[PDB]
Amino acid sequence: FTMDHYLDIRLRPDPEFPPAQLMCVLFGKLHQALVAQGGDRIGVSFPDLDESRSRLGERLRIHASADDLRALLARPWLEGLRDHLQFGEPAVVPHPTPYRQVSRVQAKSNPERLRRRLMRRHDLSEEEARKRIPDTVARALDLPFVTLRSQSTGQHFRLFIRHGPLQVTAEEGGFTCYGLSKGGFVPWF
RNA sequence: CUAAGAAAUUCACGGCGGGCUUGAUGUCCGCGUCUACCUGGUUCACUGCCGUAUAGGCAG
């Protein structure tokens, strides 16, 4: 109810990639721009999120402090995207901000990794380890994912993140490693 | 509400003996394929990590 400094990031189109690859590379610029930058009370907000469309966002809405956003505008590590996307300026926030939920949460929709560690620890067989794990223990989470196709697996992958409910009261807290919610809400407008 | 309505084909068996198909040959001449392109499908709604219970620092 006190962090009223926003830092928006408008996404323009480019012919060499869609918005999903720009959201993945900008996701790397956030994991290395915040995790390799510093500042716990700096979060991000995705305003084009839709759980029925599998989208991530059509315009970034950053939320930081006064100097937490006043010193990130002149970032030479924020270059490159100045030619690919567009920027803005600082603007005030309204009084009643709705308490929304946006953060990262990893789900375990695969029993093959726990079947590998369970084959190295439990000593399961083919039919005993294959039958000790039922088919209903795995599930695909249809949230807004990001194809973070980095140098761990060569093919395209998905993204996992869990959001929170909507509310009106303010409950602030410390941001996560990617500028999300982990016990503290964020405004959504 | 039908050219309506109904129905046991059964049993058995030795095909078998013999043969010379041969002789001879020219497939020939000629030919313009060519211009243009973003694979990033997800070459698996994903691949290995504290709990065989959904909680994660992952190479993402």
CSV table of C-alpha atoms (C1' of nucleotides) in Angstrom, one decimal:
chain,number,residue,atom,x,y,z
A,1,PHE,CA,0.0,0.0,0.0
A,2,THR,CA,3.1,2.2,-0.1
A,3,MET,CA,5.1,1.0,-3.2
A,4,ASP,CA,3.6,3.4,-5.8
A,5,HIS,CA,6.5,3.4,-8.3
A,6,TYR,CA,5.9,1.5,-11.5
A,7,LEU,CA,8.2,0.6,-14.4
A,8,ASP,CA,6.3,-0.6,-17.4
A,9,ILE,CA,7.7,-2.4,-20.5
A,10,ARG,CA,5.7,-2.3,-23.7
A,11,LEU,CA,6.2,-5.1,-26.2
A,12,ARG,CA,6.5,-4.2,-29.9
A,13,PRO,CA,6.5,-6.7,-32.7
A,14,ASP,CA,9.6,-8.0,-34.5
A,15,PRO,CA,9.8,-10.2,-37.6
A,16,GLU,CA,12.7,-12.5,-36.3
A,17,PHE,CA,10.7,-13.9,-33.3
A,18,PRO,CA,7.2,-14.0,-31.8
A,19,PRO,CA,6.3,-12.6,-28.4
A,20,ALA,CA,6.9,-16.0,-26.7
A,21,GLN,CA,10.6,-16.0,-27.5
A,22,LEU,CA,10.8,-12.3,-26.4
A,23,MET,CA,9.1,-13.3,-23.2
A,24,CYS,CA,11.6,-16.1,-22.7
A,25,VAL,CA,14.6,-13.9,-23.4
A,26,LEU,CA,13.1,-11.1,-21.3
A,27,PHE,CA,12.5,-13.8,-18.6
A,28,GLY,CA,16.3,-14.4,-18.7
A,29,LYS,CA,16.8,-10.6,-18.5
A,30,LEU,CA,14.6,-10.7,-15.4
A,31,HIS,CA,16.3,-13.7,-13.8
A,32,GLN,CA,19.7,-12.1,-14.4
A,33,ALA,CA,18.5,-8.5,-14.1
A,34,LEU,CA,16.9,-9.1,-10.6
A,35,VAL,CA,18.7,-12.2,-9.3
A,36,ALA,CA,22.0,-10.8,-10.7
A,37,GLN,CA,21.0,-7.3,-9.7
A,38,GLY,CA,19.8,-7.0,-6.2
A,39,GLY,CA,16.8,-5.6,-4.4
A,40,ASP,CA,14.1,-7.8,-2.7
A,41,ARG,CA,11.3,-5.3,-2.9
A,42,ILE,CA,11.1,-5.3,-6.7
A,43,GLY,CA,8.3,-7.3,-8.4
A,44,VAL,CA,6.8,-7.7,-11.8
A,45,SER,CA,3.2,-7.9,-13.1
A,46,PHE,CA,1.9,-9.6,-16.2
A,47,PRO,CA,-1.3,-7.8,-17.4
A,48,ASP,CA,-2.1,-10.0,-20.4
A,49,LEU,CA,-2.3,-13.3,-18.5
A,50,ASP,CA,-5.0,-15.7,-19.4
A,51,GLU,CA,-5.3,-19.3,-18.1
A,52,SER,CA,-7.8,-20.2,-20.9
A,53,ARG,CA,-5.3,-19.1,-23.6
A,54,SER,CA,-1.9,-20.1,-22.2
A,55,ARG,CA,-0.6,-16.6,-22.7
A,56,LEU,CA,2.1,-14.8,-20.6
A,57,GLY,CA,1.4,-11.1,-21.2
A,58,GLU,CA,1.0,-8.3,-23.7
A,59,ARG,CA,2.6,-5.5,-21.6
A,60,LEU,CA,4.9,-5.8,-18.6
A,61,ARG,CA,4.0,-3.8,-15.5
A,62,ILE,CA,7.0,-3.5,-13.1
A,63,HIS,CA,6.6,-2.4,-9.5
A,64,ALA,CA,9.6,-1.1,-7.6
A,65,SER,CA,10.6,1.6,-5.1
A,66,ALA,CA,11.6,5.2,-6.0
A,67,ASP,CA,15.3,4.5,-6.4
A,68,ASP,CA,14.5,0.8,-7.2
A,69,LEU,CA,13.0,2.0,-10.5
A,70,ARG,CA,14.9,5.3,-10.8
A,71,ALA,CA,18.3,3.5,-11.2
A,72,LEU,CA,17.2,0.8,-13.6
A,73,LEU,CA,16.1,3.0,-16.5
A,74,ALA,CA,19.7,3.9,-17.5
A,75,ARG,CA,20.7,0.2,-17.6
A,76,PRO,CA,23.4,-0.6,-20.2
A,77,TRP,CA,22.5,-4.2,-19.5
A,78,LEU,CA,18.9,-3.2,-20.5
A,79,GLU,CA,20.2,-2.4,-24.0
A,80,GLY,CA,19.4,-4.6,-27.0
A,81,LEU,CA,15.7,-4.7,-26.0
A,82,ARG,CA,15.7,-0.9,-26.6
A,83,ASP,CA,15.8,-1.8,-30.3
A,84,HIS,CA,13.5,-4.7,-30.0
A,85,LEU,CA,10.8,-3.4,-27.5
A,86,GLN,CA,9.7,0.0,-26.2
A,87,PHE,CA,9.9,1.7,-22.8
A,88,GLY,CA,8.1,4.3,-20.8
A,89,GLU,CA,8.6,6.5,-17.7
A,90,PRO,CA,7.7,6.6,-14.0
A,91,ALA,CA,4.1,7.2,-13.0
A,92,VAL,CA,2.2,7.3,-9.8
A,93,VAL,CA,-0.2,4.6,-8.5
A,94,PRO,CA,-3.8,5.0,-7.3
A,95,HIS,CA,-5.0,4.7,-3.8
A,96,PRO,CA,-7.1,1.5,-3.9
A,97,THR,CA,-5.0,-1.2,-5.5
A,98,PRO,CA,-6.4,-4.7,-5.9
A,99,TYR,CA,-4.4,-7.4,-4.1
A,100,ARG,CA,-3.5,-9.8,-6.9
A,101,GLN,CA,-1.3,-12.9,-6.9
A,102,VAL,CA,1.7,-13.4,-9.3
A,103,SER,CA,4.7,-15.6,-8.5
A,104,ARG,CA,6.6,-18.7,-9.5
A,105,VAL,CA,5.6,-22.2,-8.3
A,106,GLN,CA,7.1,-25.4,-9.7
A,107,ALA,CA,4.9,-28.5,-10.1
A,108,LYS,CA,6.0,-32.1,-10.3
A,109,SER,CA,4.1,-33.7,-13.3
A,110,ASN,CA,6.6,-36.4,-14.0
A,111,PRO,CA,7.4,-39.6,-12.0
A,112,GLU,CA,10.4,-40.5,-14.1
A,113,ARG,CA,12.9,-38.3,-12.2
A,114,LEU,CA,11.6,-39.6,-8.9
A,115,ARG,CA,11.7,-43.0,-10.5
A,116,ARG,CA,15.4,-42.3,-11.2
A,117,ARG,CA,16.1,-41.3,-7.7
A,118,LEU,CA,13.7,-43.9,-6.5
A,119,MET,CA,15.6,-46.4,-8.6
A,120,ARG,CA,18.8,-45.2,-7.0
A,121,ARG,CA,17.4,-45.2,-3.4
A,122,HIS,CA,14.4,-47.5,-3.2
A,123,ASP,CA,15.8,-50.1,-5.6
A,124,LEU,CA,12.7,-50.6,-7.7
A,125,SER,CA,12.3,-53.0,-10.6
A,126,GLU,CA,10.7,-52.6,-14.0
A,127,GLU,CA,7.3,-53.9,-13.0
A,128,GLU,CA,7.8,-53.1,-9.3
A,129,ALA,CA,9.0,-49.5,-9.8
A,130,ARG,CA,6.7,-49.1,-12.8
A,131,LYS,CA,3.7,-50.5,-10.8
A,132,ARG,CA,4.7,-48.7,-7.5
A,133,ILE,CA,4.1,-45.4,-9.4
A,134,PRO,CA,0.6,-45.1,-10.7
A,135,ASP,CA,-0.4,-43.3,-13.8
A,136,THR,CA,-2.5,-40.7,-12.0
A,137,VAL,CA,0.5,-39.2,-10.1
A,138,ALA,CA,1.5,-37.1,-13.1
A,139,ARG,CA,-0.4,-34.1,-14.5
A,140,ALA,CA,0.3,-31.3,-16.9
A,141,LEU,CA,-0.3,-27.8,-15.5
A,142,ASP,CA,-2.0,-25.6,-18.1
A,143,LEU,CA,-0.9,-22.3,-16.7
A,144,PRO,CA,0.8,-19.5,-18.7
A,145,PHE,CA,4.1,-21.1,-19.6
A,146,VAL,CA,7.2,-19.7,-21.3
A,147,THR,CA,9.3,-21.7,-23.8
A,148,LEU,CA,12.7,-21.3,-22.0
A,149,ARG,CA,14.6,-23.4,-24.6
A,150,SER,CA,18.0,-22.9,-23.1
A,151,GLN,CA,21.1,-25.2,-23.2
A,152,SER,CA,19.8,-28.0,-21.0
A,153,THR,CA,17.5,-29.7,-23.5
A,154,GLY,CA,17.7,-28.7,-27.1
A,155,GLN,CA,14.0,-28.8,-27.9
A,156,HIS,CA,11.4,-26.3,-26.9
A,157,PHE,CA,10.1,-26.7,-23.3
A,158,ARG,CA,7.3,-25.3,-21.1
A,159,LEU,CA,7.2,-22.9,-18.1
A,160,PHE,CA,5.7,-23.4,-14.7
A,161,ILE,CA,4.4,-20.7,-12.4
A,162,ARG,CA,1.6,-20.5,-9.8
A,163,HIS,CA,-0.5,-17.3,-9.3
A,164,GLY,CA,-2.7,-16.3,-6.4
A,165,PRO,CA,-6.2,-15.1,-5.9
A,166,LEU,CA,-7.8,-11.6,-6.2
A,167,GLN,CA,-8.4,-9.3,-3.2
A,168,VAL,CA,-8.9,-5.7,-2.3
A,169,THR,CA,-6.9,-5.3,1.0
A,170,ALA,CA,-3.2,-4.6,0.9
A,171,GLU,CA,-0.7,-7.3,2.2
A,172,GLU,CA,2.8,-6.4,1.1
A,173,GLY,CA,5.9,-8.6,1.5
A,174,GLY,CA,9.3,-9.4,0.2
A,175,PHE,CA,9.6,-10.4,-3.4
A,176,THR,CA,11.0,-13.7,-4.7
A,177,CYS,CA,14.1,-14.4,-6.8
A,178,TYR,CA,12.2,-13.5,-10.0
A,179,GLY,CA,10.2,-10.6,-8.6
A,180,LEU,CA,7.0,-12.5,-7.8
A,181,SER,CA,4.8,-13.3,-4.8
A,182,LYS,CA,5.8,-15.8,-2.2
A,183,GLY,CA,3.8,-14.7,0.8
A,184,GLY,CA,3.3,-11.1,-0.2
A,185,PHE,CA,0.6,-9.8,-2.6
A,186,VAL,CA,1.1,-7.3,-5.5
A,187,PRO,CA,-1.2,-4.7,-7.1
A,188,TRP,CA,-2.9,-5.5,-10.4
A,189,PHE,CA,-4.4,-2.8,-12.6
B,1,C,C1',-49.0,-59.1,-39.8
B,2,U,C1',-43.7,-60.5,-45.0
B,3,A,C1',-45.6,-66.7,-51.9
B,4,A,C1',-47.0,-66.0,-44.1
B,5,G,C1',-46.1,-70.3,-40.5
B,6,A,C1',-42.2,-76.1,-40.1
B,7,A,C1',-37.9,-79.3,-41.2
B,8,A,C1',-30.7,-83.8,-39.4
B,9,U,C1',-28.5,-85.9,-46.1
B,10,U,C1',-25.8,-90.2,-44.1
B,11,C,C1',-22.1,-94.1,-44.2
B,12,A,C1',-16.8,-96.4,-46.9
B,13,C,C1',-12.6,-95.9,-50.5
B,14,G,C1',-4.7,-97.0,-53.4
B,15,G,C1',-4.9,-92.9,-59.5
B,16,C,C1',-0.5,-95.5,-61.5
B,17,G,C1',3.0,-97.2,-64.8
B,18,G,C1',7.1,-94.9,-69.1
B,19,G,C1',9.4,-90.9,-71.8
B,20,C,C1',15.9,-86.6,-75.5
B,21,U,C1',12.1,-80.8,-77.2
B,22,U,C1',16.0,-79.4,-80.8
B,23,G,C1',18.7,-76.3,-84.3
B,24,A,C1',20.3,-70.3,-86.1
B,25,U,C1',20.6,-64.9,-85.2
B,26,G,C1',23.7,-56.9,-85.3
B,27,U,C1',18.5,-53.2,-81.5
B,28,C,C1',20.0,-48.8,-84.0
B,29,C,C1',20.6,-43.2,-85.0
B,30,G,C1',19.6,-37.8,-81.9
B,31,C,C1',18.7,-34.5,-77.6
B,32,G,C1',19.5,-27.7,-72.7
B,33,U,C1',15.3,-29.7,-67.3
B,34,C,C1',14.9,-24.5,-65.0
B,35,U,C1',13.7,-20.2,-62.1
B,36,A,C1',12.3,-19.3,-55.9
B,37,C,C1',12.3,-20.1,-50.8
B,38,C,C1',13.4,-18.2,-42.4
B,39,U,C1',11.9,-25.5,-40.7
B,40,G,C1',11.8,-21.8,-34.3
B,41,G,C1',6.4,-28.1,-34.7
B,42,U,C1',6.5,-29.3,-28.9
B,43,U,C1',12.2,-34.5,-34.0
B,44,C,C1',7.3,-35.5,-26.0
B,45,A,C1',1.7,-29.7,-22.3
B,46,C,C1',8.6,-30.7,-21.4
B,47,U,C1',14.1,-33.4,-19.5
B,48,G,C1',17.8,-34.8,-14.5
B,49,C,C1',17.4,-32.1,-8.4
B,50,C,C1',15.8,-31.8,-0.4
B,51,G,C1',9.4,-36.2,0.9
B,52,U,C1',8.3,-43.6,-2.2
B,53,A,C1',3.1,-37.4,0.6
B,54,U,C1',1.7,-31.8,-5.4
B,55,A,C1',7.4,-28.2,-1.1
B,56,G,C1',12.5,-26.1,-4.6
B,57,G,C1',18.5,-23.1,-5.2
B,58,C,C1',17.8,-26.7,-11.9
B,59,A,C1',21.7,-27.0,-17.6
B,60,G,C1',16.1,-24.5,-18.2
